[PDB]
Amino acid sequence: QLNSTEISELIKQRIAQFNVVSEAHNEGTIVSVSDGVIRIHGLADCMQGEMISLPGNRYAIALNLERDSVGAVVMGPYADLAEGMKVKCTGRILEVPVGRGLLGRVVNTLGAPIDGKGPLDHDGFSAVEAIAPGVIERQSVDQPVQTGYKAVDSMIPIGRGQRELIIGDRQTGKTALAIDAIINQRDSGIKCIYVAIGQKASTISNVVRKLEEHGALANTIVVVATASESAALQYLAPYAGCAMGEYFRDRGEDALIIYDDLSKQAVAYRQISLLLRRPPGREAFPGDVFYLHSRLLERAARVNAEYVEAFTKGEVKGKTGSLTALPIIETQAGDVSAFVPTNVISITDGQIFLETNLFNAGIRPAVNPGISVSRVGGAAQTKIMKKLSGGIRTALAQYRELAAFSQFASDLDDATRKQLDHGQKVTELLKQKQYAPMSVAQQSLVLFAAERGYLADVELSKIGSFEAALLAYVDRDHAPLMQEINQTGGYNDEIEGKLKGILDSFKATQSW
Amino acid sequence: MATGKIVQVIGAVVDVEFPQDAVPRVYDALEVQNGNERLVLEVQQQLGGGIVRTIAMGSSDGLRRGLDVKDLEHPIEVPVGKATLGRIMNVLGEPVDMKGEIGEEERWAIHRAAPSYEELSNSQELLETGIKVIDLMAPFAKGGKVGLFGGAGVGKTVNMMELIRNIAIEHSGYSVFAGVGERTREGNDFYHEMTDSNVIDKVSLVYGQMNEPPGNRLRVALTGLTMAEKFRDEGRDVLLFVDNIYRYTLAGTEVSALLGRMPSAVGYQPTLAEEMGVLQERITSTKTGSITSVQAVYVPADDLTDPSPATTFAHLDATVVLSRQIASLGIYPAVDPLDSTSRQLDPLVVGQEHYDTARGVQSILQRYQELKDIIAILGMDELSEEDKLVVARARKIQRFLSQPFFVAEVFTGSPGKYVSLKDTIRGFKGIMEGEYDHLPEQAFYMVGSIEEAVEKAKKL
Amino acid sequence: TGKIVQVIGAVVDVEFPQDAVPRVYDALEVQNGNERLVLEVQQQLGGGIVRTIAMGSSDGLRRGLDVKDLEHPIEVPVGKATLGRIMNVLGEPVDMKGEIGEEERWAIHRAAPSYEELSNSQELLETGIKVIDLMAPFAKGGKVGLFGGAGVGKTVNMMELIRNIAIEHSGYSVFAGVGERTREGNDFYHEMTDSNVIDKVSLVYGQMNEPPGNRLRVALTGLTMAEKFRDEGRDVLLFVDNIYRYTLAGTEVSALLGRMPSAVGYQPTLAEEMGVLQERITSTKTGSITSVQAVYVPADDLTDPSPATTFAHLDATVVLSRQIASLGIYPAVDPLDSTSRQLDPLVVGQEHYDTARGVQSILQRYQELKDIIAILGMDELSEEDKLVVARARKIQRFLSQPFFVAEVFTGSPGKYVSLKDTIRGFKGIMEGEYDHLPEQAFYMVGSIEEAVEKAKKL
Amino acid sequence: EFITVARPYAKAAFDFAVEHQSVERWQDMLAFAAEVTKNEQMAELLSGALAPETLAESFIAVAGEQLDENGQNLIRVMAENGRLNALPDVLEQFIHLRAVSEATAEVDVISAAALSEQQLAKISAAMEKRLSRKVKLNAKIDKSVMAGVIIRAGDMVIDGSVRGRLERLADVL
């Protein structure tokens, strides 16, 4: 037996008049304050998801509409509020600045500039919560987005309009891979968005300083929800980034959006749910945490030209728009059977698994190709890369099948010894240094060198120097071929001839 | 008139209170004007006096307390019949393909009782699918159920596309595709592939997409079932494709957690084994017609033992397990011949010919597994003259199980091949008898029928 | 004006007039017998009720006592006058000297500095500890965390860092003892005072004797003092003796505050409680805070929510382990789990970076062999895997060092090893130029020359 | 037990009655409303799952002794929350709040044999100094005590019974 916000003076009011004299349904009064949740009494006409306006310039989102209470979460510092403050229900839902002028700015979850470079020049506002494009409005994804990593572009292609999860343990290069995927777009025509959930501000400062060393910051938006900000903002942060990315998609341009640790958005939402007393499921997560990420990631889409023409009212014709997502997840001790990883692995179109046993042994990026998947597959590759990467899957597959013998390798036969020592070389080939991305011509050239047997003589200790020398050789001598591959991605018997000649002349007349 | 009023809204769960004369029944459908739009709610529980707890079949945002709610005095009911062929519909039977109204004569409620054990009939007519490995290693009869088990990226969805294409083109049978928790990218690729292959006019589609609330994703299996039942009453033999049972069970778990039921074994609802039976028990062949079913089932983290795949096993008649290792060596359909199984694979039903061919193939592959690890150490020349023969024939058999699909042409440009069961048995039985010991291995790779291996050997 | 109406453990409920109700985080005062007790309000419930935590022993409180509303948060002395003195959580002096002659008092609840104000500094900071500044070097103004179970050496390491940095450093320094032994606070207070460095160190103690309110709020007091020194334009050292006790004290209070439990019984607000602290301890354009934080790991489980949510807030993470300390190898740092933001070729130079990566590579390859070594014995190893095992064990020994503060435990005198002098030694061991020495030649020595010498004497 | 959920309603009803001077009418109104809750046929209805407004309107009908606006409004507010069974406790806490406001007390005096009516005067006079309130005695006779007297005033007792003395001595040993 416990009370439900029936208290002395409210009851007395009702004693004197049970049928409340008609009173504004557009306002109510705070009756409770705790941990960022306020209980409001009144607000007969409040709608779920509505924005409620508090003294000062602050807002709350109405999430629980109960029998004579509205549970709302304060978007900002709440400790100032107090029982009895009056509050009004705006008719509105949350909206965020949207425009082309956000590129290069750092903005918080409400689009307020946080870098101090002065106000924004946006292009109007967009609702943070929106429905994704329908089934009939899509178009099949058949364009590559290049990360500049041999291991990812060869064996786990990402296509414009895809949703590729990056998942691994702590400190394995999850953020590194995504920020190299961003830096590599500086001259690709894809606008990037990096939204950081629950990180400490001095990490964001550092990634922005690295994005600005390289020329990438002029072409990317940063949305920050630091670890000190209230849960409502950390939980709504990804949707503001999606609402800023959908500006480009819906106008026939391409965007790329990186949600950094959705596994922290899930935690902020768990906090909000447990403070509103909602029934906990597994690991105390609320029931609907799948519907949380699902309706977020289903906004990444490629939309056909008819949808663009309808949306821009004929102003843009003949161009498809796209939005690509790379949500990041953190698994404790490599458990992919926890509640949050179990959902996002089921929503997305692919998975990049980063492993710490590989990261320590020096294989960086630590991509694990045996368990990584891309469902779009070769449809998102340039046909030169699609042709050449097909031999790497088989090389590494036979290697994974023979790897168990590495410890008895002395007793093996020379037939399988050659496969076992080829897999090691094509594995040592996929290692790569940070912030050093490769154009598709360089990747194709190196994967060609590996597939066609050229590296068989080179000792395992020299593959890195071999590659490093080969790239400089080709750069000084054969710039006109690289300039052709990088621009067409095409593959021919003529192209194969030219490449075979390059490799012969290099391996005969150079040294590494 | 509209007799009810909303009294709570908490996420997707809405409480509505009616006068106690006219409380809706369970599973009834209500209707409310969510702004400039219409929203239907499905009653889950009659709790307390006049109050009813419901699940919203749509976005809950914009709902106020006190809105007027009207009860449609019948469950959710969807269009059925020939009118639905070639259309895409959501859980409520509304078209999501922009081709306009459905044109249906008749509407059926999606909640109905399964056939009684005496209305059934057991007939052992094998389906012919046109895929070598499936027809040979995992035969399944009309009215039975097949489960495509495997991890992610192995081929469940393109295997189902291929089965649909074959059934629709080579046997002119109708089909229904229920996309329980469907990724819109794959749903659109499926729509364009069915319409390009010119089979759309014999499939009817139902999509509960991932971005929809749990209630939509849960009830879609029953809408697909109801359409397949309408086709059965007409005396047809239909085929029902469920795109993932795993997401049916997940939608059930979410719906359970929202209604506050006390959870169970690993966070799954308590009613898991009852929901699975409510679904799987309406799929049967009755004396008037037949529903066959093939069902993709994701196994999370390769363990086959957590409740979601563990419970479904009780209902399947055949299981085809797909492996990413096999797929990575490039031999699609990526079916493992040793672990796939069928209850119909016994001589009394498939004849001694098919049975002996199947067991002989499994035995040769099982022996090649043994010899692999001697070949690795001792090298191959230490094998007998007979064992080198088992090796060459096992490698040929292992190539021959691969096949080029008509729907995979978009991935590789290669044209598809349909292989009858006679050709399958004849080809494998020939290979195992040394009839083709003179051809090279690669002559059998992605070659379709056996007579096309001899053609390909001339060109190699 | 208020009345107490409930007393559950450490949380007290107080009833105020409808229009006089305190604000969140205000401080109230009760007269608990011949004592004055301070309550800090946490929540406003309906009807003028307000729920509080007692900054003191809760025993002896009746219902109906009158509580006085002080209209301000908890405020602590701050600035130069708080220097060389021990203080309570409430800012009261706790040594037997007189009152603190402070000019100014600050509220312990503050907002973290704006993103616009932060600053970034690659200036490497040398510590004479081989493993820490080979594997996980840290920078002036950065955060360091020492992760470890119970009894593995994350306080001895912190006292050696104090020795190597905080005596050789000019600016002020702050030490917050959150929920740790009072014996060690006394030992530290006298070690300071008997070497005259006390008058540049400010101390705050909330040791484990004290009820949950003190251990809960005592970290914010140390942070407030450090932030005052930062804003004056100085650069400061802040050492926190166990930050895990700041959240455990929240778990204790959480259920009484009426909040549903979360993953392993933790409060639902764990990540926010931790972030709103860890976010104000940072350097900025006006001045810098360099910090070292000891982070206890319960049940040695590094995937527990409380350690797991902390790794994201640190720049250098040094992970101590029991399976190494029980070999007698101190400091028991795990090099396959320690890490630093600063370990880049562009920050430490190609040679330091490359040595560190080679050391990780060898030790990892050695981990991979332990199962086959355990089953089949060491003789089945390839002729070059035996060499990997020998160099890995030599590297495991050479990572050990004698500290100056651990003389009391082992007699042997301390050693200081410079960075230039350790990368040279590890490059030597890896390149094979010491393969003729025995393993024991490397255990507990300074630079590599002392190993080459110890080998003569066996 | 409804001791904790009765407090708000008791305080609200007492404040309202105080403002309008009708405390003595409100106490009778609450007494009758509590009496209708004890009825065999009504205590069945209150347990049913009737809707609040229907339960209130069918409960209001059984009482014409309620001042039509406010006394019924209290019933309606309580019925909304499903607390009509709390009336027998709202009544007692209303009586207590009244006794506090009118500074009155009611102390039991338990004795082995009746007192002389001159003793009682002294006891009452002394208590009226022990308490700010005007006392009302209700003496009783108990044979377990056998000399002296027990004075119980609220939850404070002053024990001068010989029985208490014996059983307090036995523990000294």
Ligand SMILES: Nc1ncnc2c1ncn2[C@@H]1O[C@H](COP(=O)(O)OP(=O)(O)OP(=O)(O)O)[C@@H](O)[C@H]1O
């Ligand atoms: N290709 C690479 N080569 C060498 N080092 C790398 C590479 N990629 C990442 N690293 C290093 O690994 C360390 C961890 O990387 P990163 O921070 O990206 O991982 P993370 O998962 O984001 O860590 P956190 O758990 O803090 O998010 C960084 O210091 C980075 O310098």
Ligand SMILES: Nc1ncnc2c1ncn2[C@@H]1O[C@H](COP(=O)(O)OP(=O)(O)O)[C@@H](O)[C@H]1O
């Ligand atoms: N028979 C096949 N031919 C060519 N590619 C295939 C085939 N089967 C699967 N794939 C590849 O696998 C990817 C996803 O297959 P799919 O069946 O959707 O996996 P899942 O079973 O996880 O849904 C496709 O994009 C395709 O590239």
Ligand SMILES: Nc1ncnc2c1ncn2[C@@H]1O[C@H](COP(=O)(O)OP(=O)(O)O)[C@@H](O)[C@H]1O
């Ligand atoms: N360098 C060292 N040499 C010898 N013993 C050490 C060294 N460092 C730590 N120890 C041992 O570690 C034990 C654990 O002590 P302590 O560091 O206080 O653990 P905790 O970190 O839990 O406080 C000490 O009793 C001490 O013997």
Ligand SMILES: [Mg+2]
């Ligand atoms: Mg990161």
Ligand SMILES: [Mg+2]
């Ligand atoms: Mg699929």
Ligand SMILES: [Mg+2]
């Ligand atoms: Mg300690």
